[model samples]
Target chain A: EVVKFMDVYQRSYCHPIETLVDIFQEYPDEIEYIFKPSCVPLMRCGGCCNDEGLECVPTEESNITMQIMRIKPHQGQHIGEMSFLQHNKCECRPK
Target chain B: GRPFVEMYSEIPEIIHMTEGRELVIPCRVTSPNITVTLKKFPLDTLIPDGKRIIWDSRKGFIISNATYKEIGLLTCEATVNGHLYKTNYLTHRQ
Candidate 1:
């Protein structure tokens, strides 16, 4: 008996921030200022469904609070903190 | 990486919300038939209820008219393939 070949596809969802290079690119030129909010980047979910009729997206996204410092020409230095929403978790499953 | 579940919020951070104010948190699970839940950190007791927390299919976990007594560090959990995935966040008092 002969078997037919099947198409293959990859799945990825809700991936965590793994040393993303894009975040560092943002400060490449903005360093001119004395100091700024020391923030980090939280990446979004994946988007490769591979036409398998399965959808991949973030299942949980929440914000975390942090203390940020700001230094300007006149203000010198100051402290600040706030919450920033970020998405986490991803899974690709069948409908 | 190959774990059946991934719960974020592991990052060392807190929710910058006043203790006397309302807070809203959302948990989205990508699995089709997933088991997701919310609870306090460390001790990890108590289920979400109207007395302190409310759940909406559209919005998610909502804390209205809450004090520190009703707010604190919360852990969100999701179960898939006989495994539990978790993440937690703390409520920063203003």
Candidate 2:
């Protein structure tokens, strides 16, 4: 006798911010944020790392910084950027 | 912890389109005292309100007939009450 098995496939889509919200929901206490200085861009340091097989999304830190520096001042206030980073206290792991 | 400034949106972190296509990255801030600015990266410069780039002052950025040069990181910077909040998106051209 011979037996055969078919492969299974699944497709799904998620909104960009939904993932961010998901991380925040899982580990509410593990998140922190940084405010940008004058002529600076906010930088995030592993805010979404939950120790699951999935890792935090990647971003271009240098690219953001350079752009922040070039922002022209409006009303005498140089525009700045902010970001969310993760803290060490949270232990959220997904299997 | 409380957010320094209230901000949320449905915009994607990255937007992909073919050359000559148009797209807008939406940014919304709930803070009363806030200023928003957009910057396109690699050039590492803020987008001036001119021909191809249109700054909406509140709605975020509008790229009309985008090109390879416009393909890069797009960062939205919002300053609220002397504090700064930022969001990023990528415009990929095929």
Candidate 3:
């Protein structure tokens, strides 16, 4: 005697932030934070790694310091250029 | 056998307690004449993402509601002009 089985497949999608930027056709003054985990871009250390099975998350010691750059986009030939709204060292602690 | 009880200075420090549990983040100070004051350094400083926090020392300034967001380095400054003093840093964590 022989037996057989049938199966179905499905997928839920999440768009990449970079890819979704295309829909905006422009950048807003620091687009309202959509609360994405990827928003906290991680910079790794020497013996680095990320959460994925790929590598370990690195401890970053900033001497040059990390910067939070706010920008504003225009609508013409300067469309893609991000004008400097402000530049600041990333600092959030003593909450 | 123990003879004397040891006392400690209550500087601004972290107080840990379960959420929804009552906790007191005491800012202990020693002064001879004047009453010590405690105030929320920044106006409208909230907890657990800026929820209104309550406290005891309103006459001077005191921050209560010791939440995890309130769990961090704190400064306890004791001013005694004629005496040597420094701002103490108390770090609190979960």
Candidate 4:
């Protein structure tokens, strides 16, 4: 287990917006709710907080409002308007 | 019955935490068009703050470093459709 690509890049491990992904529901693994316009990509917290090897996690955040629709497939669609938190401040901590 | 104002987390009547520990009581609301506020009893005002106490709409109230002086009834208020919903979490020293 000796890979040489470890120290080549001494990256800045500060909190940064380096991720764009679709957000359909909170706790995706636990809940299975369908959403319309589900692929609206947005900036999310990412990057490492190079402090003794810690992962960057959100310490403070901002609520971003967007209109969406929850497809219930039966009881008509539930109102999908929601405000979600986007990480504004972050710190290096546990994984 | 459909919910106008919804709360995702349920808290006990009282919460016990050791001094110097971080106290975070989160009130999760799924609706976007609602107002959330946190108040400390006896003071009847938003928890005092600048550095020590923080009120995040999504995360509720946070105390970075807890102390015995902060012991009180924490009132979490969420308003939806002209109706007010409340949740209480009392902080106590353990």
Candidate 5:
């Protein structure tokens, strides 16, 4: 994958301060940071249909990464913005 | 030479698993001689080798008979050349 300078999302979701600190310490010079949150609830049921049942595993394309960064001008803020980096360009099977 | 690192494959933002099933989180590092560790999010303890969770330097994590309570943010941390590269995978139960 290409590691280009991607724009940090102006608005993102909630994340932990520890995660932010890890990014800051890991990539001190990188302005655009990527990460993932600690919790995600089950939004959809996979094998609610039959006996074959869900494998209890993620989808074939079930992969994701997090993109995090300080909100530009707010360079020194303890909080940062976080966005989802979709893998395989596949969204979860909607509930 | 300074060690540079990147993800070998994508780690899903969210993983869908069922209770009482096995789950493995994948992680690969380009750097040589790196140490890999695993942990659950919001928790302070690093996962030790056990029947529940096993850590593999190149393959990531193997979770046996996972349950809803086990569902949470799973982190894979790789340390290479004194630098740290980390990633996350969220597991949800059905």
Candidate 6:
């Protein structure tokens, strides 16, 4: 299957980040940034879904995918942006 | 351009089963654009038709009460506007 440049939505419901890739996809070039309070739930779910302690398994396509860092909410900062090394140049570049 | 997503198929890299054991092989999606359709092997038949065993709108289909008959070379197909995505297959130990 062909990967697209953006997340595909069916009915335009809640637009929230669901993957670490989703959180970083929009900010590929930026070195540092801040997390908005409202984007907390999405980040939390994405973190849980892609956590290392939980045996982060990759989908069949990208079987070699890694489970690197971990995310924990700071008090008052329900959503915090995580800084990590981009997996590859291809992943860094827009899909 | 219209959203013409395709279906996809996948199988676990390794399958494990013991006599009378229930096995669940996962199907992964590389493309989030399309929905999934789990087709039984040989005939390539879709399960539950349009509204069956859907996890999310994006997730295609799942097989329930799986047995040896459901075990041979399973395939999952994703479709959108008549376009196809991927078809993956794996074997089940009966």
Which prediction has the highest DockQ against the true structure?
6
Candidate 5 Cα errors over 4 Å, as ranges: A1-95, B1-12, B31-33
The TM-score between candidate 5 and the true structure equals 0.41
Q: Which residue pairs come into collision in candidate 4? A: none
- Looking at candidate 1, what is the lDDT of residue A72? 60
> Which 10 consecutive residues of model 2 chain A have the lowest summed lDDT?
A6-15
Q: Which ranking of candidates, highest lDDT first?
A: 4, 1, 5, 2, 6, 3
What is the per-residue lDDT of model 5 for residues A1-95, given as tens digits with 9 covering 90 to 100? 65321111101111211112344443456545333332322222232211132222233233234443344443553444443322222112223
Q: How far does residue A37 in candidate 3 sit from its true spot (Å)? A: 28
Candidate 5 has a DockQ of 0.02
* Model 1, span A1-95: residue lDDT tens: 53321111112322444322232244455454443444455555654433343455666777766565656666567765644555676543343
lDDT: which candidate is best?
A: 4
True contacts kept of 6: 0.00
What candidate 6 gets wrong by more than 4 Å, as runs, is A1-95, B1-14, B17-21, B30-33, B49-64, B80-82
lDDT of model 3 at position A33: 27
For every model in order, the fraction of real contacts preserved is 0.00, 0.00, 0.00, 0.00, 0.00, 0.00
Q: TM-scores of all models?
A: 0.39, 0.39, 0.30, 0.39, 0.41, 0.32
Q: RMSD of each candidate?
A: 17.6, 22.7, 18.6, 21.1, 18.6, 17.3
Worst 10 residues of 6 chain B by lDDT: B1-10
How much is B90 displaced in model 5, in angstroms? 1.1
Candidate 6, residues B28-68, lDDT tens digits: the string is 55556545566643344655542323434344344444444
lDDT of 2: 0.44
Interface RMSD of each: 20.3, 17.3, 23.2, 20.2, 11.3, 16.2
What global local distance difference test value does model 1 have? 0.51
**Scoring each candidate complex against the real one, what DockQ results?**
0.02, 0.01, 0.01, 0.01, 0.02, 0.04
Highest-TM-score candidate:
5
Sorted into a CAPRI-style docking class, model 3 comes out as incorrect
TM-score of chain A of each: 0.45, 0.18, 0.17, 0.58, 0.20, 0.16
Error of 6 at B15 (Å): 3.2
DockQ: which is higher, 3 or 6? 6
